[PDB]
Amino acid sequence: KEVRKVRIALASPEKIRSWSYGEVEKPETINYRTLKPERDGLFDERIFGPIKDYE
Amino acid sequence: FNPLYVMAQSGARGNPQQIRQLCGLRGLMQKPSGETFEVPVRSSFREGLTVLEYFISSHGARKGGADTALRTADSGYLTRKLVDVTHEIVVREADCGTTNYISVPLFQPDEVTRSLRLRKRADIEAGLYGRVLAREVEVLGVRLEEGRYLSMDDVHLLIKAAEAGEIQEVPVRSPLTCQTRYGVCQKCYGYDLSMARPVSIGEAVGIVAAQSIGEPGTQLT
Amino acid sequence: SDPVRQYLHEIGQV
Amino acid sequence: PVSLETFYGDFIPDEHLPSPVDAATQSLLSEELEKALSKLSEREAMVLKLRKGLIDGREHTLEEVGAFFGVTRERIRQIENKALRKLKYHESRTRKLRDFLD
Amino acid sequence: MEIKRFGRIREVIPLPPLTEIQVESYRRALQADVPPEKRENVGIQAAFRETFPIEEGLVLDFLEYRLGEPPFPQDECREKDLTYQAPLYARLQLIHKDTGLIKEDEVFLGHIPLMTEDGSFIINGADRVIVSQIHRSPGVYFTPDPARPGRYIASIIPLPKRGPWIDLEVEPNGVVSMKVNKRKFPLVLLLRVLGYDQETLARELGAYGELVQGLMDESVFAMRPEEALIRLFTLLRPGDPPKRDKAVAYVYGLIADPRRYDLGEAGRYKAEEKLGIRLSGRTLARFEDGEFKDEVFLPTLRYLFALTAGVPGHEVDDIDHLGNRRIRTVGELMTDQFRVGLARLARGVRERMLMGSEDSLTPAKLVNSRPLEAAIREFFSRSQLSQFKDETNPLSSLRHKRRISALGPGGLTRERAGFDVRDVHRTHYGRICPVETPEGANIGLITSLAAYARVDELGFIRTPYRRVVGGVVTDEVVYMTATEEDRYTIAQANTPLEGNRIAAERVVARRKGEPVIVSPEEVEFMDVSPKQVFSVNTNLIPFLEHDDANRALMGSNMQTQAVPLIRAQAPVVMTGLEERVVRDSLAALYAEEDGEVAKVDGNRIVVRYEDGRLVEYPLRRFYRSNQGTALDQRPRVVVGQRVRKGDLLADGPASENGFLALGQNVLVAIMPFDGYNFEDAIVISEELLKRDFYTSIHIERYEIEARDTKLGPERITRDIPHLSEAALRDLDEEGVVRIGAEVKPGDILVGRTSFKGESEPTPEERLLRSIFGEKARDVKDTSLRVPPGEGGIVVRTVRLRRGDPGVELKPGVREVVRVYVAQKRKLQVGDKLANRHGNKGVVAKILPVEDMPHLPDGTPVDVILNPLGVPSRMNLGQILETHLGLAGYFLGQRYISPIFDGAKEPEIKELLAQAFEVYFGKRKGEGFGVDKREVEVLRRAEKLGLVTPGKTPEEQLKELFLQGKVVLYDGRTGEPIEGPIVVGQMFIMKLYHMVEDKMHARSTGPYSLITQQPLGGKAQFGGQRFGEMEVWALEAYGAAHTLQEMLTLKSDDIEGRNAAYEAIIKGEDVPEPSVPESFRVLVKELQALALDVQTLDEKDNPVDIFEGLASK
Amino acid sequence: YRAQGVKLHDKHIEIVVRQMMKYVEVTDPGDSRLLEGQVLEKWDVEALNERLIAEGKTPVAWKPLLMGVTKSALSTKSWLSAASFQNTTHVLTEAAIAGKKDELIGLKENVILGRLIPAGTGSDFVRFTQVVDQKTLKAIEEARKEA
Amino acid sequence: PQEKNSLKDLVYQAFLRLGMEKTARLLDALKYYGFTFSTTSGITIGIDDAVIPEEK
Amino acid sequence: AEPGIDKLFGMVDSKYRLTVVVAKRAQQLLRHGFKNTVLEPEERPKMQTLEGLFDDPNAVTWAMKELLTGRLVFGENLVPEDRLQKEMERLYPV
Amino acid sequence: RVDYSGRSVIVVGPQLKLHQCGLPKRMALELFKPFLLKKMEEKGIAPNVKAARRMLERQRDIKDEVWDALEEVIHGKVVLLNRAPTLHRLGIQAFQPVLVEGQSIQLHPLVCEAFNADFDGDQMAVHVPLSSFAQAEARIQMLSAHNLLSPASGEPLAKPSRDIILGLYY
DNA sequence: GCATCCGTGAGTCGAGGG
DNA sequence: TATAATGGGAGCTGTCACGGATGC
RNA sequence: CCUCGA
């Protein structure tokens, strides 16, 4: 299907939670030794997605 | 056959004021306040100036440089605003069928108000060339028909006719009166001035207008 | 306006 | 760490997404591997594709490919060996797959 | 060759030391040569005396500081990317008021960067310059209120970041208001806090009609200073509890606290001179015996009332006057950042005095130097006035050091800079050059110190004048500020003098900048020289008086862009300043005393002086500068040569026998040439390359690091996977390219291997591996290669390793390797040339010699300039330079033609006649008469009125030669040019803008992280920006597909660009584009703003541009 | 422009001025849902008024409105255009509150989307044109002729 | 004599009468001969070419 | 200037329609290896190799020259799209 | 920012025809590099594409026949030249590229006015239109020789310059 | 109706230096 | 994990034209 | 940010 219009509207808390793949519960980015993302933090692959293709 | 004279007269280089500064006097100069110094530079660049004369001139030189510098920003900003108002304006159809038009006048009231005198040739050309007649015009035993794209010769003829008292204003189709939605039709726009022929439908005409107004912007003093 | 001034005032109430 | 917007991040390339050259190179590699696999029998080409894991993404054991074709693991290993051998012959002949080894 | 100088003006004083504005300023700030107890309260000494004593141990006081010797020399500092600095120690004593115990120690505060001999710095191995800043001087000013004519505003201005500006206005309701921190309040309140009474103010301010009545408010006089102080503290601090000690503290810090409020020393002087008062300190009031005592306010209000009423002797102020603008030099700016770092150190000192053991505290336990270190480090590394030094040529650095900027910390933010700041004020005369400024945005905001100008201890610029008493011109020269200069009548430097007496009954002079014709009886002073009006660069332009200023600007600026040439020459026409510039830029090496030269070498000169001592001067040879130009010195003396003090020993870069050599003297013809010099382009002869004119050495630096990783170490090695002996040929055993090798784009400078990571072999890789039976190696080739368009000969290699003596690197890096690559640059097509008169252009054609216009004796011209560049540019100085250059070409001599006092037309004509004799009588004796072509050209010239009819061919050729013109033959036809052509020697330079550095192209390359659009810049192999306006161009043409291509397939449509590259390498047409990735970025960033952005179709049903990958 | 010797055709200025006059202000709503003082486009109010006149209802009383070039550009229907111009915050909040649909009529919107612009070779007037040789044309004509 | 205005009118008239292909050929020809003749023309600039009139 | 550009502009009501015609025709020629050209062997645009005159590889030069002959037909809704595609694939296979 | 683009100093190109510009060899190689790879495959210069790219990788590996291949690649094609600032639509124009030795773009004398270009150090950017549609647009609508009159006034825009005027006048 | 404080804009493309 | 400890601290400001709320 | 170029 071809794009014709572009609409912009306020987002309801339910809509926002529907976008979300997980809640970010910790202000953690990555681990100081492993340099891998921390659980429930801002870079967690559990929410946002895998860092490597299909792994 | 003097080099300066030749370059100036041909148009290859130079204008009278520059040649004057090279040969005659350099002239009056402005103080930093914009006020003019009472005594001018009497020297030419041929003769060379005094350090005081050179200094007196540096004021205006610098003010002009600063004027150019602060100007280009305002010109560019203006251009962007003009682009943003006009960008959707495109030649969308061949004719909107409007019966409305504007009447370009060929005479302007004198500042004395002593009469109504003729407009300058270039001004009439800039208001008439390439336009489309919205009404029949019969002048000097010539019929210029409704729907005619005015050639430069048609314009010169209309000027001649005005000089003979036959016509004081020309009815013409114009984007002011076009009824095309989201843009303009072919007849109300007239020539694609780059090709001296009627405009192709699809011409991005508002962008062209914005660029045409904005490009000389840094020349305006 | 300034949040620490506001908090210091609220604290100066008790 | 330091701020990307110091901008300072506009000098930072993306090592992750494959470049257009890399994408085209893997494309021509897959196309040329299929060109070369077509010169084998469909069973030996299929044995190689299963053993390399191309068909379903992972590499099967010899017993899985052998039970897939209904044959002994020694037999499927011998089919893989002769398929690899014919591939080595064709490649030494036409020299087509050499450049892709870096 | 003999040098003839023109001009009748005898200049009383030489130019001052040109870098003195830097060197003396910094020496004054540091006082490192002064025994501590003799130091003045200026400089970093002032910063110490401001910070200390620190109170509430109970007390920490400062005795003295000292600067040690630098840990490393300047060369080594450039090598190892260090800062050239000295350790700073300060003696502090801790005193407990109760215990009486006194513990004193010398604490180490870190290092302070040292200025080099030439007034520059070395910060992290890079030479930098601290640019002086111009700003409004502190003081008390009175301006016309722009809203209300007849009303005026009084403004009290301290030093930047030394307290707020204060305004005094007379309100339309009649009450006099004070504004501070954008808070208007009645001045009478503060007057009451100062301890004034209605009687005192009524007798002081009563004489002014109806004005003092607006100052009378009875509710203010009905309260003692205490209650009025609390009232003002409430008016200035809403919400803060009005406790008496808190109000005293705030108001004291606002006005009376010298540790917070500071007029300049110049601020105090100007306040005193304006208001007719005397200041004890530098604050507006004092705290004396528990009460506030007034210094500034009442005199200011008196002056304001008097200016409003119109009483005589009271005038408004011109804030652009150079008596009300002052210069902050390097010493002052550095001292300011020193003061800030010290303030932080003291805050930490008090924070430590409250914590910790109260019994056991040393100076060392109390003081953490780190914040002071940080302040110095930031001032020198990241301040706006701390600039990467321009050392393209020695004049570049000297000009950089004499710059004046109006931007910077506390400086005018741009777009707040109107016409007034950028104007040249009449008071610029003799202080700030009126021509040398940048064109474009920075015009008027960056300027240059005039050649004779000086910055005094108060920071005002002073210029020298000669005392004139009773028509007699003394040799006493007085340096005046603009304020002082406005008192006198100053005659022009060219006023005719017989001996020391004025010889003209009418004398041109200045009175407050106004030109006036005046009798010798009226002359109070006289200019020292025309040179004193212009910068150092403008003073290098011969015949400046014949060049319009807008192009003199360009010639001035472009001299700093000139590249040092291997065969560089001084100009055949000079201004006389050419040697002082070499001397003061420390380019060339000179003799320290009389002596005899012992040894002379490419590397070293050994000299024996009159003392018998043997001094050895090593020569800097093929060194790289900030801009990549070769800096080196060549010996100009010979073994056994007798030398006196100040005689030339070695020539620096762009120096010929101690003269400034920014370019080459070339033989020029001014004529069109087949459109190849259309619109300022230039035509040159291949003969210039054959003899190595306009050839320069350029050195580039390349750097690579081997670091520890979490996947294993990087290493510099010769063992690199999948590379033949062809690739590793010029690499030595350790893997670094060998000295002397020629390196081309793609060649390896330093081999390096890195362990592979995240390695999942794709099934194609596994199958190909099995087919070719080769194990994938652990590491991969990360070597440093020559970037496209670069290369040359390797001339140096530096290698630093971890675990090696003197070597410690940033954490994790094992080693650093730096390769230096020199190249010899011949002139080529696209390189920029220019002259001193603003004539600039790019070489567009290089003709073989036989196509060059040539003189009848067979000599071909070097370059062909188009005459159409001259008329509208109005820079005729280049024409006079050309005529005198012709004369000097045939006489074999050079000239010195000082600006505004130099070679005039008649003397140039005399020289041209002398030259004509050499150019022609030689031929007439050699057995040749006039030529047929010369006769035809003479006929044409007769029709032009260029020669008189009836004279002989030789007489007419001489008439033409005296006009500078000569007969010239087209080398292609051998037929003469129908006219006689202007031909002569011109001084021309190759500017730093060479097409080699600028030519760049890209098919595909690195893309940005977030936007997935190409990177920018030649070094990143970047793409060109197709901005909004290029888009407008394409839209106007109606080229929808060209534009969509620009927006998708060529930038950030990932699938599109990959598919396009594959299509083109397959010989297929390009696929239709798809959504650009940065639009998806926009959508996701709007979602982050809690806004839902929906792409819809015509049935208003959503469309997924993320292809389901973002939906659950 | 004449005083600086710049020759410039009136119609460019006329186009810009026509955009300056794009809007009107309501003096009386008539039978419409509009409010007194509500600003809108002359085209839209003429459409509403011809709908109400063909319906027999009362037309909207309206007055012409001159606004300068910045204000006219910020008042355009397309929110992508307006937000990319300037006042991004104001434009985006009002567009989001009103739930505005951008129909992608102009050039800026489609540039932002990477779509093919509605001008030149991208004009609906010319972009569906087809090219065929007489060989293929007659070979298709026969296939239409047998059915 | 041929100068800026007359050459401009020439180009315009040629556009109107002969089309842009021929006008482009014309422009190239004008370019070639203009450059050729300006080379040999004798045009130059010496200081004596800036002629102070005695009337000054 | 492109040869015969004035006649090409004469052929259409809008110059952009000329551009669309030419580009679609160039795509046809590239897709079918020029086997569908309306150009006689002598009207074939040529390019000067080092060996000698070879065919012009530029499909747009071609398409313009074809357009100048009159042998091409342009317009809106002359045939369904997939029908033109399949008939060209039939007469000229890829 | 955009791929298949470059920039260099401009130099006057008097010998050029109005529809032409001088393009440096190395600029052209990098700009057309995929087409060059394809053509090098079409001839004996490389067995495949990857070998040809590795062949162009180093400057001493580049041989003569690849330049002739580049000539066969650019035949009939145009590039866009652009000068900043782009004040009106003629700040971008289309030209047939003529391969030149050297590193400077060669610009035609009659278009400088439209670009506000001269040769005191100006630089221009080059862009390669990729598709058949891009090249049709560029060769028809944006070609220099097709845009001779000002879209603003209607007067000739590409017209005799001072140097040209000077000879004709003389 | 008319002063006043707040917010938002003020040319492009390069290059380098960081 | 226990002596008692109780409201911060940085603060240079040389533009201008627009809509819009805020006040007199 | 700065400086520089157009």
Ligand SMILES: [Mg+2]
């Ligand atoms: Mg230029």
Ligand SMILES: [Zn+2]
């Ligand atoms: Zn219409």
